[PDB]
Design a protein around this ligand. Structure first.
Ligand SMILES: COc1ccc(CNc2nc3c(ccn3CC(=O)Nc3ccncc3Cl)c(=O)[nH]2)c(OC)c1
Ligand SMILES: COc1ccc(CNc2nc3c(ccn3CC(=O)Nc3ccncc3Cl)c(=O)[nH]2)c(OC)c1
Lengths: 122, 122
């Protein structure tokens, strides 16, 4: 019976992305080969099975640096990080395989399924 | 030209609320008279002009406790905190004034405007 604010969640996410852009309250650096990306652990956990599994463990909860698998493409990771914070996925025929493999590694099942649909439709 | 995931933002918010429910990565306690509420500063900043103005200031960025104005009703605050994390506002004729006044204090203009519409429609 509560009143629904249909833009609230999108507004929240946009504002979280603004905070990331200003490095406000970011609490982890994700290192991917020669590149690094700062983020909020909460958003990573909300969007990725890998990050959820890492930070839910009290043993790893306070890590400030995560080194991703050396074989992960920083491009693929960047695309997915921007998706996490925007709901918009930049899939193209020139990056689909990198994005899909990265999404498998990050355990983002719905994104992987969408990548498969992209392949089917191309 | 990016692919839009129309449920992603809502899913993120739901997951953030799940993290709050488990006290995972919460980083502030909001004290409101005799009650206390834990939350994520990022979500508070995303949803409230008061919290945004507080935590954007490097002087207050690292506060772990915020004591709200003693005149603020903990009920009104609780209702609004749950709105922040759910997009659903529990307005009723028995709580409208408390919620509205609290939303004014928290600088949640759209919620205040909605409270005014509620009054107009009642
Ligand atoms: C409810 O059963 C779960 C929960 C979690 C996992 C991990 N696998 C996974 N996780 C994903 C996605 C997409 C985002 N997430 C993160 C997420 O759901 N986070 C979250 C969940 C519950 N409460 C708070 C939070 Cl932050 C994904 O495709 N697979 C699971 O794997 C089988 C099952
Ligand atoms: C863009 O101009 C602004 C930004 C902020 C304020 C503070 N007044 C206010 N803030 C509100 C609501 C509802 C949620 N918020 C928080 C918010 O917008 N947070 C945010 C903004 C930009 N980047 C990152 C973040 Cl976290 C509200 O009704 N009034 C402003 O007041 C005039 C103007």
């Amino acid at each position: 019976s509560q009143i629904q604010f249909t833009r609230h969640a999108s507004d929240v996410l946009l504002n979280l992305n603004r905070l990331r852009s200003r490095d406000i309250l970011t609490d982890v650096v994700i290192v991917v080969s020669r590149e690094q990306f700062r983020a909020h652990k909460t958003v990573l956990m909300a969007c990725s099975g890998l990050f959820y599994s890492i930070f839910t463990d009290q043993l790893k909860r306070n890590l400030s640096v995560i080194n991703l698998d050396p074989e992960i493409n920083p491009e693929g990771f960047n695309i997915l990080l921007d998706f996490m914070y925007t709901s918009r996925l930049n899939l193209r025929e020139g990056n689909i395989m990198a994005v899909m493999a990265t999404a498998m590694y990050l355990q983002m099942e719905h994104v992987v399924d969408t990548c498969r649909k992209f392949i089917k439709a191309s």
